From a paper:
Six molecules organized as three dimers were found in the asymmetric unit of the CTD. Each protomer in the structures is comprised of five α-helices, two 310 (η) helices and two antiparallel β-strands. The CTD dimer is stabilized by extensive hydrogen bonds connecting the β2 strands (Leu331–Ile337) and the interaction of residues from the loop between α-helices 1–2 (Arg277, Gly278, Glu280, Gln283 and Asn285). β-strand 1 and α-helix 4 (Gly316, Arg319 and Ile320) also play an essential role in stabilizing the dimer. The CTD structure in its apo form shows an electrostatic potential distribution that is conserved amongst all N proteins from the Coronaviridae family, with a major positively charged groove located on one side of the dimer surface. This region—which is flanked by Lys256 and Lys257 from both protomers in a CTD dimer and further composed by Lys259, Lys261 and Arg262—is thought to contribute to RNA binding. We observed that this positively charged groove extends towards the CA-binding pocket through Arg259, Arg276, Arg277 and Arg293. When the apo and complexed structures were superposed, we observed no significant changes in the overall structures, as judged by the Cα RMSD (0.19 Å deviation).
Numbering used by the authors:
A (entry chain AAA), B (entry chain CCC): 256 to 364
Write the structure that this text describes.
């Protein structure tokens, strides 16, 4: 189907199916509690997470972009940081929501 | 206008105006030669670059997401990698196009 970076997780094709298991390794995603993992973009608070994701123009404009070649193939690398607005009246709710998903897999039964 | 991560660069609002000057530091973008800097999404080969940009779902599914509280504010950190298809006949040209823009800023004021 679609290249991995263009996939959209849903209830029918979830975060694990599209992007693999959450874990600690540099190759793994770490974001998502059990609800977000099974629902993807169907998750009730998805829009509040998607407001932090970069447009294509911002992805290539804000990030440090590189190319790394490994035994698995050729990779476009990306790093960066998005500053939350502490004058956003939703700031405190945004922190709480991001805190619920970052490394949430560590607590899974 | 838009938050930084949702901005769209164009000739009318360019990569420097939207995302700041290219540079070597951690929250400095390093991507784009003078033509892409000037034109943003009006760049003639923008679709060949944007094919590698992640969906919101993939950005939060693939990336390693962190939160840092520093003297400057609260930051959402992100790292990851997007696999190129080395079997795509277009692979060689994709690599040339990306490398044209990665760290181009080092060659001009």
């Amino acid at each position: 189907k679609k290249p991995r970076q263009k996939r959209t997780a849903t209830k029918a094709y979830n975060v694990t199916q599209a992007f693999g298991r959450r874990g600690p390794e540099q190759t793994q995603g770490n974001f998502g509690d059990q609800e977000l993992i099974r629902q993807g973009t169907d998750y009730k608070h998805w829009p509040q997470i998607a407001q932090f994701a970069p447009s294509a123009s911002a992805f290539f404009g804000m990030s440090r972009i590189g190319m790394e070649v490994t035994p698995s193939g050729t990779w476009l690398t990306y790093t960066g940081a998005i500053k939350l607005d502490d004058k956003d009246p939703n700031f405190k709710d945004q922190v709480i929501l991001l805190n619920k998903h970052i490394d949430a897999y560590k607590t899974f039964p």
